Design a protein around this ligand. Structure first.
Ligand SMILES: C[C@H](CCC(=O)NCCC[N+](C)(C)CCCS(=O)(=O)[O-])[C@H]1CC[C@H]2[C@@H]3[C@H](O)C[C@@H]4C[C@H](O)CC[C@]4(C)[C@H]3C[C@H](O)[C@]12C
Ligand SMILES: *C/C=C(C)/C=C/C=C(C)/C=C/C1=C(C)CCCC1(C)C
Ligand SMILES: CCCCCCCCCCCCCCCC
Ligand SMILES: CCCCCCCCCCCC
Ligand SMILES: CCCCCCCCCCCC
Ligand SMILES: CCCCCCCCCCCC
Ligand SMILES: CCCCCCCCCC
Ligand SMILES: CCCCCCCCCC
Ligand SMILES: CCCCCCCC
Length: 226
């Protein structure tokens, strides 16, 4: 009965219901282009649902000694993010017809971001936790830079309605993704200022917005149709 369980339960509900709704809508669509966006976007909260559910049931949690104490760390978050973050970037790349080499570079950077974040989260020497955090944050900023400058440039060649939908999704992505390193820094994995229950609340609001919110915006747009 960990106090953060309530937010894990609410995250589970929200991701579950989001997945179900996207699946129902997606299965009804016949346009092949729209179907690809549905397939990618439905998978995102589906993966998050399984990881939130696992954490709700007491899995994906480990104790890491640092700063003279035994600290609880939810590593299952990284398993979710390893797969869902590149899927979200793929949605954006597909909207703007980004180059294959750009997608490869972003997916590589994304793997670095999640992998070094996880190594950070598991590191037993307090100061070194922040070296890995800094490397992960640098990878994230490379991603946001490309999604902001590179993808907008590509969007300028698309019809205005596709460009408009892209810009809303780009803006949501920049605002939400840039919060994650700060929550990590001040929370359980970092400085230990924000207690685990509140941190779990914060990550739940961010996760639901970045996956279900993002998905609602994308999947209700005419932009996904070919
Ligand atoms: C019975 C099993 C395994 C026991 C070993 C234990 C281990 C983790 C437990 C859940 C979580 O703690 C979160 C939550 C706390 C609420 O208080 C009551 C409900 C809930 C869903 C718990 C139910 C149950 O107790 C679980 C599944
Ligand atoms: C659905 C989940 C989303 C959109 C998650 C995004 C998560 C990140 C951008 C995480 C970034 C991190 C850093 C920038 C450094 C510290 C650890 C990471 C994983 C939290
Ligand atoms: C023409 C070139 C150059 C370069 C580059 C710049 C630098 C740096 C950094 C950082 C960050 C971020 C992010 C973005 C976005 C919204
Ligand atoms: C006393 C010592 C040193 C430390 C640290 C810091 C460097 C912070 C640079 C952050 C780059 C992302
Ligand atoms: C005596 C100490 C030294 C240190 C520090 C630091 C500055 C490193 C800044 C790195 C920025 C990327
Ligand atoms: C598209 C060619 C540019 C490739 C740059 C790859 C980059 C970077 C990464 C990251 C991390 C710390
Ligand atoms: C893939 C990036 C690997 C960078 C290694 C840096 C070593 C950190 C010293 C604690
Ligand atoms: C001794 C702590 C400083 C380690 C610096 C690691 C450099 C990271 C390379 C990207
Ligand atoms: C806006 C948050 C500031 C409060 C941080 C905390 C603590 C003592």
């Amino acid at each position: 009965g960990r106090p953060e369980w309530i937010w894990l339960a609410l995250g589970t509900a929200l991701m579950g219901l989001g997945t179900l709704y996207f699946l129902v809508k997606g299965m009804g669509v016949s346009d092949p282009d729209a179907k690809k966006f549905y397939a990618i976007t439905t998978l995102v909260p589906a993966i998050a649902f399984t990881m939130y559910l696992s954490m709700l049931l007491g899995y994906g949690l480990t104790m890491v000694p640092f700063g003279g104490e035994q600290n609880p760390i939810y590593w299952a978050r990284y398993a979710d993010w390893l797969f869902t973050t590149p899927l979200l970037l793929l949605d954006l790349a597909l909207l703007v017809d980004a180059d294959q080499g750009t997608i490869l570079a972003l997916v590589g950077a994304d793997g670095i971001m999640i992998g070094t974040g996880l190594v950070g989260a598991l590191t037993k020497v307090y100061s070194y936790r922040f070296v890995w955090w800094a490397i992960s944050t640098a990878a994230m900023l490379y991603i946001l830079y490309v999604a902001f400058f590179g993808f907008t440039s590509k969007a300028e060649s698309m019809r205005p309605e596709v460009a408009s939908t892209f810009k809303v999704l780009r803006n949501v992505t920049v605002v939400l993704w840039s919060a994650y390193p700060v929550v990590w820094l001040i929370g359980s994995e970092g400085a230990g200022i924000v207690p685990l229950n509140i941190e779990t609340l914060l990550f739940m609001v961010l996760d639901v917005s970045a996956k279900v919110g993002f998905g609602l915006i994308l999947l209700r747009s005419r932009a996904i149709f070919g």
